[PDB]
C-alpha cells in the first residue's frame, strides 16, 4: 500500500494536467500557429505524455498493473485447428501486447511449423501451409475488429463526446447534403487516382 497523502497530491496533479489539456484542446489555431513547434496541439501532446508517465508512477505506487482497459488488451482466442499445440501457439502470437501486434502470413506459417516440428506431429508441408492460411485469415479478421473497436471507443475528446449521428446538420439541410454528396464523389475519385498513379508509376520503372 502507498502513502495516502502522496497518492492524493499526485491525483490532484493528474487532474491539473487534465484541465490544462482540455484548455489546450479548445485553442483555435490559425495557419501561422500550425507552422509553430510550440502550438497548442504540440503543447497538449507533450502534456498527455507527462500525464501518462504520472499515471504509470501512480500504478507503481498502488501496486496495480499498467493496464487502462483498452480493447486491444482483450484476448483473442484461437481454437481453429485440430491440434491444440498449434492453436495455443497462434493465440500466443496474436495476443502479444501493444499497438503493433499484427503478424504476417510468414509469422503464422512459422508458428505452425514451429509448433509442428516442436511437438513432432508429423504434418507434411501442404497440410501445414493450408492450416496456416486458414488461421491467418481468421486471426486477421479478429485483429482488425479489435483495432476498429479500440479506435471508435477511444476516439476524440470531451468536445466530441456528445456526438450522435442523428444530429448531423446534413439531415435537415438538402443544400448541405447535396454539397457533401458532390464532395464524396470527388473524394472517391481522388483516392482512386492516387492509388492508380503509384501503380502506373510502378510499371514505368
Amino acid at each position: 500500500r502507498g502513502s495516502r497523502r502522496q497518492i492524493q497530491r499526485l491525483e490532484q496533479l493528474l487532474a491539473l494536467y487534465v484541465a490544462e489539456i482540455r484548455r489546450l484542446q479548445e485553442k483555435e489555431l490559425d495557419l501561422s500557429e500550425l507552422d509553430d513547434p510550440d502550438s497548442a496541439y504540440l503543447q497538449a501532446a507533450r502534456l498527455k505524455r507527462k500525464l501518462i508517465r504520472l499515471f504509470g508512477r501512480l500504478c507503481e505506487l498502488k501496486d496495480c498493473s499498467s493496464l487502462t482497459g483498452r480493447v486491444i488488451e482483450q484476448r483473442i482466442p484461437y481454437r481453429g485447428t485440430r491440434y491444440p499445440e498449434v492453436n495455443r501457439r497462434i493465440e500466443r502470437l496474436i495476443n502479444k501486447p501493444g499497438p503493433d501486434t499484427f503478424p504476417d502470413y510468414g509469422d503464422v506459417l512459422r508458428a505452425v511449423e514451429k509448433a509442428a516440428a516442436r511437438h513432432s506431429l508429423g504434418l507434411p508441408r501442404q497440410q501445414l501451409q493450408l492450416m496456416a492460411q486458414d488461421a491467418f485469415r481468421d486471426v486477421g479478421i479478429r485483429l482488425q475488429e479489435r483495432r476498429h473497436l479500440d479506435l471508435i471507443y477511444n476516439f476524440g475528446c470531451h468536445l466530441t463526446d456528445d456526438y450522435r449521428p442523428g444530429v448531423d446538420p446534413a439531415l435537415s439541410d438538402p443544400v448541405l447534403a447535396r454539397r457533401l454528396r458532390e464532395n464524396r464523389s470527388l473524394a472517391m475519385s481522388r483516392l482512386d487516382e492516387v492509388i492508380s498513379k503509384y501503380a502506373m508509376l510502378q510499371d514505368k520503372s
Partner: protein, 98 residues
C-alpha cells in the same frame, strides 16, 4: 487477473485516449504542417481547434494502417516479398473500399 488502478480524479476513458495519443507514429509537428499545407489551399482565414488536428491525426493513421493490413492479409507466399504499390492497389480492390 492483474489489479487495475482507477484514479479518483480522472476517468479511465480519458487516460486511454491520452495513451493512444502517445502511440501515434507520425511526428506531430510535420503532421500539423501537412494540415496547414492543405488548409492554405482552401481558405487563408481558416482556423482549427487543436482537438480537430488530434482527431485528424488519429483517423489518418488508422486509415493508412488499414491499407497495409488489407495488403498484408492478401499476401500469401512461402518466402517473404517486398510490398509494392500494385500490391496495395490489388488488395484494395479485393478487400478494401470502393
Amino acid at each position: 487477473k492483474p489489479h487495475r488502478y482507477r484514479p479518483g480524479t480522472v476517468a479511465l476513458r480519458e487516460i486511454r485516449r491520452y495513451q493512444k495519443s502517445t502511440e501515434l507514429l507520425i511526428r506531430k509537428l510535420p503532421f500539423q504542417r501537412l494540415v496547414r499545407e492543405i488548409a492554405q489551399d482552401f481558405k487563408t482565414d481558416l482556423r482549427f481547434q487543436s482537438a480537430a488536428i488530434a482527431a485528424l491525426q488519429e483517423a489518418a493513421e488508422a486509415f493508412l494502417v488499414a491499407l497495409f493490413e488489407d495488403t498484408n492479409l492478401c499476401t500469401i507466399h512461402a518466402k517473404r516479398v517486398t510490398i509494392f504499390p500494385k500490391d496495395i492497389q490489388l488488395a484494395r480492390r479485393i478487400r478494401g473500399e470502393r
